[PDB]
Write an enzyme that holds these catalytic residues in place. Sequence first.
Site: not given
Ligand SMILES: COc1cccc(-n2cnnn2)c1
Length: 153
Positions: A87
């Site tokens: 993530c």
């Molecule tokens: C700040 O939070 C965010 C921002 C962007 C993508 C994610 N992701 C986490 N897992 N996949 N996308 C989480």
Amino acid sequence: SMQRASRLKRELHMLATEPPPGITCWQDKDQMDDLRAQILGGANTPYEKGVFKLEVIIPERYPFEPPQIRFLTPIYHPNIDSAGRICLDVLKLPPKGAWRPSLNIATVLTSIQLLMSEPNPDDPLMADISSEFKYNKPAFLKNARQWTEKHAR
Ligand SMILES: COc1cccc(-n2cnnn2)c1
């Protein structure tokens, strides 16, 4: 796409000749879009002395979609799940993500390396690890070292 092929040739050249410190990335065999990478555990992090292997798949619409990257080496971390899913904003397109074509493979591997040193517990894939990181840091560090010893050394 020939636009995509020419860009990948340039990136593979740069990853070979000017890799970011701690990071290596290479063609697994003969396909420029089937890559592997390695990030060394950072000093002053519980992952120190571990070596972390990753799979780096370059999608068909690169550079307009991000590299698809997952850990192959298990790692104990708030933002990385038990299957190695990561993530991180630069691995996703807007609106939620931060990928754009002016980033590149070296840039996102550096972002992953930074994520390893500085977790983002407010956006976890592993809620119990994240709470441990936030509220019982000594236990998180010990568990992260033990996981590094068992799987990354
Ligand atoms: C700040 O939070 C965010 C921002 C962007 C993508 C994610 N992701 C986490 N897992 N996949 N996308 C989480």
